[PDB]
Amino acid sequence: QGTQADDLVSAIQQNANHFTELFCRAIDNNMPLPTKEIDYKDDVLDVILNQRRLRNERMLSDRTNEIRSENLMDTPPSSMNDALREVVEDE
């Protein structure tokens, strides 16, 4: 194509222990939603991980809702939501 690409193969071959975690981060960033639903025939690890994901979503939503309920300066909607998600995911 003509675009410039780093030698990912050589970098993986030299420092593979780091690139395992890098690939896991990249995969977790772009993970499709499951078409199947959780049933009683699923693994215990799968339902534990599903409950952990639902818990993470619920604490994120609860912290965002509490901070919005505070209204700590009573004031740009999109910049407000950006700073809001920034403070919520940090706390």
Partner: protein, 31 residues
Amino acid sequence: AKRISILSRAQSALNSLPTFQLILNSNANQI
């Protein structure tokens, strides 16, 4: 103050924020 020091400077366009000092005034009886 951390909630104010994030939601303000990112909207009215690294920062380290120390522990705040409590200053408290009273109008009660003076010993």
